[PDB]
Amino acid sequence: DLPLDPLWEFPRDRLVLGKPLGEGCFGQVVRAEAFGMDPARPDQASTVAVKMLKDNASDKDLADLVSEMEVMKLIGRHKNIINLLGVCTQEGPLYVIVECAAKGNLREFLRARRPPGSSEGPLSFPVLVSCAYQVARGMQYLESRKCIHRDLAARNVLVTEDNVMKIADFGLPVKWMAPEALFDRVYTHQSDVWSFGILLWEIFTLGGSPYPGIPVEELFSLLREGHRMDRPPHCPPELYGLMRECWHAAPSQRPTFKQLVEALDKVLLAVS
Numbered sequence: 043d044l045p046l047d048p049l050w051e052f053p054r055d056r057l058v059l060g061k062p063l064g065e066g067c068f069g070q071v072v073r074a075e076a077f078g079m080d081p082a083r084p085d086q087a088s089t090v091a092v093k094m095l096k097d098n099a100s101d102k103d104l105a106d107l108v109s110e111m112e113v114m115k116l117i118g119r120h121k122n123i124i125n126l127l128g129v130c131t132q133e134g135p136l137y138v139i140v141e142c143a144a145k146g147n148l149r150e151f152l153r154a155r156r157p158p159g160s161s162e163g164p165l166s167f168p169v170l171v172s173c174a175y176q177v178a179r180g181m182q183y184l185e186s187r188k189c190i191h192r193d194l195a196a197r198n199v200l201v202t203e204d205n206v207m208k209i210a211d212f213g214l215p216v217k218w219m220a221p222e223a224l225f226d227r228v229y230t231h232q233s234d235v236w237s238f239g240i241l242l243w244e245i246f247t248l249g250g251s252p253y254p255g256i257p258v259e260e261l262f263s264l265l266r267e268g269h270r271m272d273r274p275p276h277c278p279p280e281l282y283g284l285m286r287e288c289w290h291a292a293p294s295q296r297p298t299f300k301q302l303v304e305a306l307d308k309v310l311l312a313v314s
């Protein structure tokens with residue numbers, strides 16, 4: 043019983059559903075071919091991802107998917123987020139259609155590009171910093187549209203055929219959480235900044251697991267006592283320094299997403 047949004051409705055007969063990408067409890071995501079997602083060249087095919095409900099699903103589940111769709115509409119478009127492309131709402135099940143990033147999530151993209159042993163891999167320093175910069179730009183955008191992510195991590199960043207970073211799942215993990223989130227259930231833009239520092243560490247370990255070894259119970263005590271992760275091998279001091287600023291206990295002493303963009307920009311500018 044959903045209204046027809048002229049800005050977003052896409053013809054159900056021009057979406058060819060394909061292979062499942064993932065299945066939750068009461069919903070799923072499938073790869074699809076869409077024809078005419080570019081209104082200009084309307085016969086062109088493109089590959090998209092489609093979120094939908096499973097048959098085993100309640101009115102609540104439907105309310106949640108509608109909420110995610112509407113929130114994505116309101117936030118609007120950016121190069122560094124997974125964008126809404128279209129919806130199918132009429133005469134059949136709810137489909138929410140989004141960009142499909144060819145190279146999967148950033149953790150897997152990094153781990154698969156780990157070079158053997160001590161050897162050089164295809165990911166240069168400037169490419170790594172560029173990954174971080176792009177994430178920061180996406181987060182600065184979401185922040186300007188009043189979106190707090192709450193689960194920023196390399197697994198929730200996707201990578202396109204052209205190696206563009208796109209933040210996923212912004213319109214719906216203790217090692218990624220700020221203290222105030224851990225202990226006080228408080229999530230702000232500044233708690234997302236803490237997570238971004240953890241993400242930075244992931245990037246510069248080529249997809250390593252945070253607080254390596256350290257059992258998930260010693261973490262809170264480590265943090266309370268002023269401990270943080272050590273500088274990863276080959277990570278320059280400047281980038282470690284940024285990680286450490288994001289992990290200040292006091293939210294107000296962490297950098298803003300605007301300052302992280304500017305810092306990472308200075309680094310990329312200095313690299314010839």
Ligand SMILES: *CCC(=O)Nc1cc(Cl)cc(Cl)c1Nc1ncc(OCc2c(Cl)c(OC)cc(OC)c2Cl)cn1
Nearest residue numbers: 071091092093124138140141142143144146147210211
């Ligand atoms: C694009 C081709 C493809 O198969 N890509 C692929 C393959 C694997 Cl094995 C893993 C991944 Cl992560 C991908 N890429 C991919 N891109 C986009 C996806 O969209 C899911 C999705 C997101 Cl991220 C979203 O965040 C804003 C919202 C919605 O719906 C509202 C969805 Cl469906 C999934 N996988």
